[PDB]
Design a protein around this ligand. Sequence first.
Ligand SMILES: Nc1ncnc2c1ncn2[C@@H]1O[C@H](COP(=O)(O)OP(=O)(O)O)[C@@H](O)[C@H]1O
Ligand SMILES: Nc1ncnc2c1ncn2[C@@H]1O[C@H](COP(=O)(O)OP(=O)(O)O)[C@@H](O)[C@H]1O
Ligand SMILES: Nc1ncnc2c1ncn2[C@@H]1O[C@H](COP(=O)(O)OP(=O)(O)O)[C@@H](O)[C@H]1O
Lengths: 375, 375, 375, 31, 54
Amino acid sequence: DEDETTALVCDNGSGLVKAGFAGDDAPRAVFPSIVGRPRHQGVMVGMGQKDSYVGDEAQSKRGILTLKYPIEHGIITNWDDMEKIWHHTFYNELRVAPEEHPTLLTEAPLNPKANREKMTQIMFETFNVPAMYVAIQAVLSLYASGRTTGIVLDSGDGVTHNVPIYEGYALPHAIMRLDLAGRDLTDYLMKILTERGYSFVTTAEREIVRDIKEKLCYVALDFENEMATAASSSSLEKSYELPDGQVITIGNERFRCPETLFQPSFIGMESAGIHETTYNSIMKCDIDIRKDLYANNVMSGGTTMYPGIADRMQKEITALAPSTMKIKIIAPPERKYSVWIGGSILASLSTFQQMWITKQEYDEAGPSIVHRKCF
Amino acid sequence: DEDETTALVCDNGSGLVKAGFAGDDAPRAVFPSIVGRPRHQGVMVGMGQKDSYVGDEAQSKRGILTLKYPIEHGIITNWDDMEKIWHHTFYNELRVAPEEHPTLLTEAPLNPKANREKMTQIMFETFNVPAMYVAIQAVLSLYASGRTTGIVLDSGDGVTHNVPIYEGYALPHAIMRLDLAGRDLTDYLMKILTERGYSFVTTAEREIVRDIKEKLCYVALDFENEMATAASSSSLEKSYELPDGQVITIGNERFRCPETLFQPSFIGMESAGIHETTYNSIMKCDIDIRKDLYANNVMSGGTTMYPGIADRMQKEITALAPSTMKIKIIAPPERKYSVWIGGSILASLSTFQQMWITKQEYDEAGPSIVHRKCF
Amino acid sequence: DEDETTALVCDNGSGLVKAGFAGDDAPRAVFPSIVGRPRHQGVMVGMGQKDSYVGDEAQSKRGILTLKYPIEHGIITNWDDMEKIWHHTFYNELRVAPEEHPTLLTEAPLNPKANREKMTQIMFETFNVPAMYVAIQAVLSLYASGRTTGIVLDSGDGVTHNVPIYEGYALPHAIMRLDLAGRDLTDYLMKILTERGYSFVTTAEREIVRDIKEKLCYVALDFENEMATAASSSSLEKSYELPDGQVITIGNERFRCPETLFQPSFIGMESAGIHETTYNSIMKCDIDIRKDLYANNVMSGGTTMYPGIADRMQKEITALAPSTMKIKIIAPPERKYSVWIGGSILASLSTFQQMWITKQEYDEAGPSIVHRKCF
Amino acid sequence: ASMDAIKKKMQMLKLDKENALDRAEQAEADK
Amino acid sequence: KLKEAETRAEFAERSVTKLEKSIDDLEDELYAQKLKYKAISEELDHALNDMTSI
Ligand SMILES: Nc1ncnc2c1ncn2[C@@H]1O[C@H](COP(=O)(O)OP(=O)(O)O)[C@@H](O)[C@H]1O
Ligand SMILES: Nc1ncnc2c1ncn2[C@@H]1O[C@H](COP(=O)(O)OP(=O)(O)O)[C@@H](O)[C@H]1O
Ligand SMILES: Nc1ncnc2c1ncn2[C@@H]1O[C@H](COP(=O)(O)OP(=O)(O)O)[C@@H](O)[C@H]1O
């Protein structure tokens, strides 16, 4: 299908998997990072039915499946389920076997080493990829956005890494890893929805709450004022259709879910929020770095698609940041897909052809080689 | 013409026994679950006269026989009479000996386990069947009806089981079994026909009422409005010919009997009826498995052949159901016989040839094997 | 009959309701949380006969009544039946007039708000109680158990709450709330008793199974070894006498019912089981919290009364827990009554007097006041 | 129909203000 | 066979009646949905013509 040995690129986290080939401007296919298994005893014979379901298969038949994510809080723990995901991710939908194509995968410097080691090891030992590279998602978001400098606040599914980069250099001492992410925002929402009479416990119920969140919730620019109205009037309530015909009406709960990003104490976290971490990543850097990082706060990844988040962050950051200086957010429509796009850009750069770990180097050094070669 | 060891299929209720061989689309013959015995003193001699009559023999000579049905609410208690029925069924009409063929018998999922153990034991120790398989009646209607998914409402002679099945899987926690069946409907009708001046008490009289019900009764869609006119005018009455040439004309009793299925309080049971049990089975299933069970209300067995029932059941579930959801009923002509048909389908599946208990496995394990091999 | 102008305490749930006055160490009486209504047509006249019966009245005359409870998995929906229960409980059984006494009612902290709002509203608007306080069941359990710290497993009729508390503080991010409870265990037992040949359908039949469960069921220390013998030999069977003189003999089913708490799949629930959810509540807490929660697994509510439950829970946690830590179950005689007792303690604490909502404050603020003063 | 007409008008006005703003900032920066 | 055919004829008359009702319900529901849906959402796109002006 490919007319060149183009690298394959995939952003595969605790949430979703985005994949396509280097040189495109988008993933060709997007899957959840899910492997599903039946939680019921079969009654009818000759029904087909798989032992395990992968990605979209797992969500489509979820009514009787338990759905697990092989990646949690930024790290792969279930390597077996990841092999099934990688095959589906790169071959079943793109029709490209990694054996003849280099592969670029993503993480962050505070992401435990086993993640980068298993990503590299699986593609080399199970898929026989000729080469590998592990990228920082912040690097890729900045390439996609047309920047070398900025803070990439990736507010994803299992972890927020908040990684500062200046003029193409990582500033790792200033990375603020926060135990608050989209999966926790889902948990908050089901607890507040329980307060309103709608309890969600099972896998199907969990996936529904994540759908409610993704389509109904918003950040807005001022939560105290938003709550003063949302808590007082039905005019800010929105109906969501549960896939059984029931309707759930969500009010100030509609923004109190994402509000956790500005109030982590809601889920038991000792933090003031993502704008505080953006501020601190910049603060930890020398002042001649800081001025450019404040002027280039970058949104990437998940949750960046909640209405009001790019503008709320600029307001919250300028409120912490020194005056006179211009504080600005970079938040293009190429948001959440900027990490994948940067992977395409990086994988295909002529100068990046010297940055790939080759299979021969891998076989000689072992799985730990990624720590010597990626960043 | 049986030159192949095809499995035999025999569905045995409190009402009728449907039997034929696997691979056909209908039972070859119906044995109406009966062993009849004379209740009078003989005076003439050299009259032949059996100690007991079986199946159609019991009905043909019923004028002086008491008719005993071996199965109560779908449970075989009089196993000796079932052996008489099975010998007659298999050898005289199907023209087969179970010794040369695998045999498939059926029962509701919550039917006490003793029943499935005896069905397995009898065919192996009395009939020397080379193999056995006790099937779920709900499953068999789904095969016959072209479904893998739906609520199967088996409103037959014995017990109404009501079991939700999704993608070929049982959802057993959502089974809503009712002690409401065709034999209670007949008793109710005998009492309300007594109110009209036609008392029915004894076996011959009981058989007449059962026949009246099957041919004259209906449910319609609105009981109270149907009653308002049935109780006011001869235009909703229907006449039935009694065996001795007398005629019984029946008015609102024509529907008051069938109505018991929707109003079980008519026979003293604390229940809301079959449409609420069907609805609750959908409700008790997971949130991502209800949008499919609403669209798949599946009929099984008899009473599904009452005029107005296909639409009343779809209507009652629709009335109980939330809006937005699509509610649909499956009520094929393969009614009152869909379970037998499913038995033929199941017995014959290539994927089912490993589900059969062989005689050697049975002899080594005993009757309890049915719970290890069938369900 | 009480000698002080004290507060009243009433732990009214989906199962049973316990009541007495604040300052005692036990409720005066426990009643089923039931309002009963006739399900039969009367024939004799001058027979008295109520439109509705409450508590002991509802159970005493149950032979001709259909019985309902007002609380659905911890949530009050039938506030009119709650009114009947509270009136009878306070007026006839505690022999007090709520108008002259503060009243304390209970609910899980994650219970939908309507529950706490109706408890506060009805006692103030229909009973004219001078003051109210909706209490947290986990708090009450710890006060009865002699603790400030631990995981409270109230494993009740409605819902299992499972909340970690440390030094008197809630740790809400770690509440592994679960929709698995005693009401499901009863329905499960009815289905498995049906498998053994003893069908149950009606309210009387349900009350009988509940009584069977409460006297015969147990958890055991090892489910697999217990079933290996119980399912193979009469030596572990125990009989129960049904009120009509029939005898039911129960084997491994005797423990399969409580086993459901550890194995939720038995009722179609997707859950790790009460011991793993307990483990996770401990593990979700900080390192300097975990050691104290391991040593303090705290029981309240029903189901904590099954023989072997305290010991199986301690074994399940120690088997998952790290070494060095001493894992302990707190399962005092105050079992099932831990919450009522705690209610008495809380209502009477001098440090709690300012926490009571007065009638004047209620009338000025309206029903929403419960969230300003209680929780 | 997506409000693309104003995603585009937004960009035009964004450019108009960004340019006016660039000038506001320069005009003050120039001292 | 006549009573059965009559049952079938009556069935079909009733089934037709049920479907006479359901066809009219679909004729009215399709009508109402179009009448309110394209009329409102197309109107909302007309409003786009104005909403997105400025
Ligand atoms: N409209 C939206 N509202 C809320 N969250 C969103 C929205 N769109 C995307 N996200 C979140 O994106 C997350 C996955 O983001 P991602 O950053 O790509 O993971 P990673 O980069 O670490 O591999 C999911 O939790 C999803 O809920
Ligand atoms: N037209 C009808 N009217 C009333 N009841 C019916 C009708 N057709 C079938 N049934 C009832 O259903 C029974 C046959 O259906 P079935 O479910 O296959 O019972 P079984 O368990 O014996 O196989 C008969 O007892 C009959 O009384
Ligand atoms: N011997 C017993 N074994 C197990 N559970 C019991 C026993 N006795 C009573 N229970 C259970 O106690 C529950 C009611 O007590 P409780 O939990 O204190 O009410 P509440 O939920 O308001 O706290 C019922 O589910 C009942 O079945």
